[PDB]
Amino acid sequence: VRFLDGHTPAYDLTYNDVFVVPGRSDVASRFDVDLSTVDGSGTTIPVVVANMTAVAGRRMAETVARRGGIVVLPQDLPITAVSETVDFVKSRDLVVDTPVTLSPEDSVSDANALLHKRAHGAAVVVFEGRPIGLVTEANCAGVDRFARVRDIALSDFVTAPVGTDPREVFDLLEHAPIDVAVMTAPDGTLAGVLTRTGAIRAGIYTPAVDAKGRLRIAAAVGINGDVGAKAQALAEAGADLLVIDTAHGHQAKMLDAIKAVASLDLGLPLVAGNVVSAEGTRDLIEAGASIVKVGVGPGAMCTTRMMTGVGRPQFSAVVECAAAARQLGGHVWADGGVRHPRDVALALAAGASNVMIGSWFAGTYESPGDLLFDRDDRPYKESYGMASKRAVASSFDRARKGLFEEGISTSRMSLDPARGGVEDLLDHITSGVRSTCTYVGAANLPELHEKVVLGVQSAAGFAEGHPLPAGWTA
Amino acid sequence: VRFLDGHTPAYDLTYNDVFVVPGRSDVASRFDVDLSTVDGSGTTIPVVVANMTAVAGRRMAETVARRGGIVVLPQDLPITAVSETVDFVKSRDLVVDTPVTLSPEDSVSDANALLHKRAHGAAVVVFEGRPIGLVTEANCAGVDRFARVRDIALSDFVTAPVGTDPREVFDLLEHAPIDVAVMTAPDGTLAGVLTRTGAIRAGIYTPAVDAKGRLRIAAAVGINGDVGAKAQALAEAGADLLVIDTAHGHQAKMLDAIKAVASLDLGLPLVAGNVVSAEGTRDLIEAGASIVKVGVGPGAMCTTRMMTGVGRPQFSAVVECAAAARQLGGHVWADGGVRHPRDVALALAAGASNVMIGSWFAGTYESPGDLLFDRDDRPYKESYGMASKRAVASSFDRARKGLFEEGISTSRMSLDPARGGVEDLLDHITSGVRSTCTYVGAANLPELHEKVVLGVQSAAGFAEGHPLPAGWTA
Amino acid sequence: VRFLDGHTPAYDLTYNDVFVVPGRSDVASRFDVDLSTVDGSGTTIPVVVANMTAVAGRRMAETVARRGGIVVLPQDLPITAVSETVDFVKSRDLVVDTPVTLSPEDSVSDANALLHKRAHGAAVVVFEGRPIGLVTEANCAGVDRFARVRDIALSDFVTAPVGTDPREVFDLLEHAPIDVAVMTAPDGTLAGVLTRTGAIRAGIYTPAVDAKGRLRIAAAVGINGDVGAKAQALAEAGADLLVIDTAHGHQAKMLDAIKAVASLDLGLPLVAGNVVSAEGTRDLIEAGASIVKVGVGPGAMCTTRMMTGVGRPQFSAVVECAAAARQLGGHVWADGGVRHPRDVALALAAGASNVMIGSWFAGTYESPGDLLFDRDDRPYKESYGMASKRAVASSFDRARKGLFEEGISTSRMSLDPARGGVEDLLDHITSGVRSTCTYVGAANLPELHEKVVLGVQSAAGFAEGHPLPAGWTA
């Protein structure tokens, strides 16, 4: 990248210490620029969900892939579970979202636990495939948590067939007291759900599709065991991207695993990490990987920076690894340290093909973790790190390792009471990246890398401006 | 009853204004006295659970009937639901309690919502009828609320066949880290659960059984509609006692309903209410009822005392109605106003055959209401009154009545963190009644009525002594 | 009245110390009993709004008279103001309520200050008489308080002509997101507003009408000055009842004023007060008054009980004055001390023709005082007493009296966040009185006096039962 004249700091910079100065801009609207990545991951937006078990899940995978991102399935899960997740994700529609389906035979608790699994805010109830009503939080607040759901269904809900123009759906939901509309198949069976905000998004975003036209999804494995067999098994079942993720990516085991996956000629683009050095990035590229994950240490749940002096400020690491990868035709991802949309924009301008986002997304409805309400009754979720799952390999055997593996750190990730959905932070991040592109004047992401000019700011320089409202950022 | 010389107050007395003075006592241990009632309800202890939908339920019915009480099924429930409740209650064992059964296919939320449905504190998991482990609160605290239960089962649990002496079970649970022991059938199938405290109680209490030997249960109906048909339907399905419960028991509709049930010659003893007058009690006895419920107004959720000057201090009402009923060979129950075991003892000495307890029991695990945790994270349940269900009889039709029916009052009934089970308040109440009998010197409940001497105390006289600890009383 | 045998207390009783015991009841539904008073005031419900400047006003007068009560215009107001109030009150419709009318030329502050002047919760906007939309609190929360109202009008509102059956209106508002429906004249001009709850009430209550068919209203004067001229002036302008109200009603000036008004032969029934003695009541009856107000001292803002030993427990005073008035064919009103509906029921059973309610009603939208929000942001109003206006008669002249007149006491009267309207407390009071009548078994108010049986309870006897929720009672 290009820095301002005289900006040659003697220290490595994180996101807070570096900024972007505007430049020659010819575009006007932020919809003119495109966010499609060129790394081969196929994402039309530069957002990638991390490999954390508290962030990556079925609902988040489907939701993010619908809006143009990709989600990496967490490492160390049964092959059956990840295969089922992939089948569900690629079985969903490209445009209409799937609501929370409940049969009247279910219990009220089965509703109250699922209304917050999606950003819709109101689950749907189906009877032999026919959607007969909606179930909201206000309906289940006063009822026993184990009465039949049929006691809670309300018949005031908007219906529309699949293929309906979102323009009409928006006006239908304009006067509807509930922001949820049921989309039904031409035979009347429930096909999905189209939120008013989701209806608006349907014309803005474009889903990341595979060669068949289904939602893209990524899977991950560790370096322990037969990495080749695990990668081949994940390839058999649906998979659009392979990510080899470890706490330390500059290991001999890392290179051996990359070589093992590359020798299988699966055709899937290969992603590895993490290294915060040009030497590590070029070594991983040479080993056969197509993409190199960068961040080790800036992870919001990563205690390596505190257990050990090992780490690096994220921005400088991304810049160096991006230069190293582009010298060899590879690509890199920024991993961790993503608290604000400015982090996404800064990492993308630093040369990353896209940005891998972790615990920030875990504080949303679509995250696999269950929603909790704190002492002050604010929506939040307890996000936790991968810990030993990123490291190399009886109860005594478990205790021998777990005594010295870094503890599973947990942070209270609060949701924004209004924009609590993952699509809402996707909107924030996409708006930020588009604003950065317009300010720079670049119409596409490689142009965003090429034309950006960066500068160094002090701690007080980070203080100016307006901070984010509650819940929009970690 | 007999009052002290010169104690002729000019005001009606509640429980707080009256006390018991000791007398000639020949018994020493409180196990020497028996608490069996003579009203025909068959309860070996004078505790009866109220007819409130927040107190009476399947679990409370079974638990209280096991320890010698009886529970009245709430009025205005479907015939199928009450029939299923009765079948379950009479299908359970007389000695061993039933634990919370979970299959490994269930979700973690289905456990976490049920561990607090019983006072055991740890649910059991069954696989094809074989109990394979226990599930406690500490196990489910850190796991996602929708993983399979099999991920939570712990194999450290005590096993013992049915018919095992509780003496051995107590010593088995002496060193067991979990206070829950699994009782299994001779073929290995799960038959029930025997808590250490429950094991101790098994030798103290004696269950209230019917003519067949199954747990007794009572059902209730209102005065609206075909009361005779409803009573006959409740008689067809298992039922050990019929309670006609209304907000006002001195009505012509009340007498007509009593006559209708009496003309059916069901044989079941008939209970009616509520009247706080001797004239009302004798009228209800003449109408055909065998038992008259007394309290109207002292109910902890009854807002009639505040909506209207209508009401009465509970103790004087119980004394007068007891005298009226005993003049005619009938029996009476104290209804409402039961906050402390002293209330039970005072009502029983006042002449009531047994005591009908309401919202105090609703603050327990066995109550049908779901357990909630307050702002300070203390276990409590939101108990609510019957409201319009105790009164005589489209959405407009519902709004016409509900606008003027008394609102469903709700109170924050806190559980005691240690003795939160309904059996624990049963132990407190039974210990109090036995202590009252020993202090009076009576070996049986009619002797408790006959030999008791009461006195009147001021508000300051209620201040002396030690108040109950948190959660033991409402 | 009749007390229980042995209930002969040595102290005068307030509402809290006395209760009602049920009796022979033949009626079942509380709509069977009628609440019409026989004192000649014409009120179909026993609720009368006090003479306090913080309670009696145009909106409260119209609202209470619509539901069957009467409101006494405060003493010491200009003749023009009370004449305008009377003309407005008698100019309104008997069934449909009038909403808050706003022209688009008005300011947003003129809306935000008026949305809380009525219990509707959403004002109406008219353009040349045509209602073009509604204005709610949520609409004005985010806008500058001085933009034009036209920027706030929302067109989603239900319309219905006058004479429409409330059955259809209820179903129309069933799915409407706003609880406010606009009632329009057959030519399209705005005629009033029919709230869903108001639509239900329209079939329950019956308005108190004059000989012409317009809403009844009462006016009040002091004893100072030419009381005859003031009464004649109030008679010229519309008036349905004359109330001579003073702090001390057993004065020679009181008798002289009563004689002066009686000599005018206005025909309007005459009400005077206040005396808490049989001698005072009979003296005021002899002086020419038809009704005697009783309470002096129990007033929630009356500091006479604290400045002076002068006063009386309200219930005993009402009983004695009721007996004194009925010995002479007169009638009495309970004045002050009305915190709960039980107070209304107890005073009515004590023999009062109806109940005069004060600061309890001032904590409502319809009260003339402006709504305030406290430190915790809870809706409340600062109710204040009449102070020197109830007593007999330059800045020095003002300071000479005001230094020794009792200070204007002020209390923080909180509204219930849900049922904050005066019609809602009217519903509570009417439901309480009807419940008392049904428990007693009386079908009409003189029968409620005749058939009621009362008893004395201690302070602990007042503790039993459930307290009111927040905001329902003072």
Ligand SMILES: Nc1nc2c(ncn2[C@@H]2O[C@H](COP(=O)(O)OP(=O)(O)OP(=O)(O)O)[C@@H](O)[C@H]2O)c(=O)[nH]1
């Ligand atoms: N009735 C009903 N059950 C559902 C629905 N979605 C999920 N479930 C059930 O709830 C379980 C947990 O839901 P998931 O969201 O898949 O699980 P999770 O661990 O919370 O999150 P993921 O990582 O997305 O799997 C599923 O295995 C189903 O048994 C729904 O819409 N309706």
Ligand SMILES: Nc1nc2c(ncn2[C@@H]2O[C@H](COP(=O)(O)OP(=O)(O)OP(=O)(O)O)[C@@H](O)[C@H]2O)c(=O)[nH]1
């Ligand atoms: N797996 C499992 N499900 C249970 C168990 N007990 C109850 N359930 C289920 O949970 C539902 C609610 O339990 P109940 O306690 O009967 O219902 P409630 O309304 O909370 O209380 P009750 O008044 O006692 O019925 C039942 O209808 C069953 O479907 C148990 O031990 N194991």
Ligand SMILES: Nc1nc2c(ncn2[C@@H]2O[C@H](COP(=O)(O)OP(=O)(O)OP(=O)(O)O)[C@@H](O)[C@H]2O)c(=O)[nH]1
């Ligand atoms: N635009 C508009 N102005 C109103 C409305 N009602 C009252 N006002 C104006 O606001 C003033 C105060 O309203 P009122 O409620 O009559 O006065 P108050 O002193 O608050 O209470 P009252 O004792 O009922 O008179 C009136 O004199 C009118 O000028 C309304 O519906 N629309």
Ligand SMILES: Nc1nc2c(ncn2[C@@H]2O[C@H](COP(=O)(O)O)[C@@H](O)[C@H]2O)c(=O)[nH]1
């Ligand atoms: N070493 C380590 N890294 C973690 C852990 N949990 C998450 N990470 C890293 O941090 C990233 C997410 O960081 P975030 O975007 O939440 O700031 C993950 O993609 C992963 O690279 C953990 O427990 N240990």
Ligand SMILES: Nc1nc2c(ncn2[C@@H]2O[C@H](COP(=O)(O)O)[C@@H](O)[C@H]2O)c(=O)[nH]1
């Ligand atoms: N009028 C009335 N009585 C109630 C209500 N809920 C409970 N009760 C009465 O109060 C009794 C329980 O009182 P507790 O024992 O909780 O003080 C019940 O058995 C019933 O008689 C209600 O909503 N209204």
Ligand SMILES: Nc1nc2c(ncn2[C@@H]2O[C@H](COP(=O)(O)O)[C@@H](O)[C@H]2O)c(=O)[nH]1
């Ligand atoms: N002496 C006196 N009585 C007052 C004052 N304000 C109200 N009152 C009395 O108290 C009554 C209202 O009492 P409430 O119904 O609010 O308890 C009024 O109708 C009036 O009789 C005041 O300032 N002084």
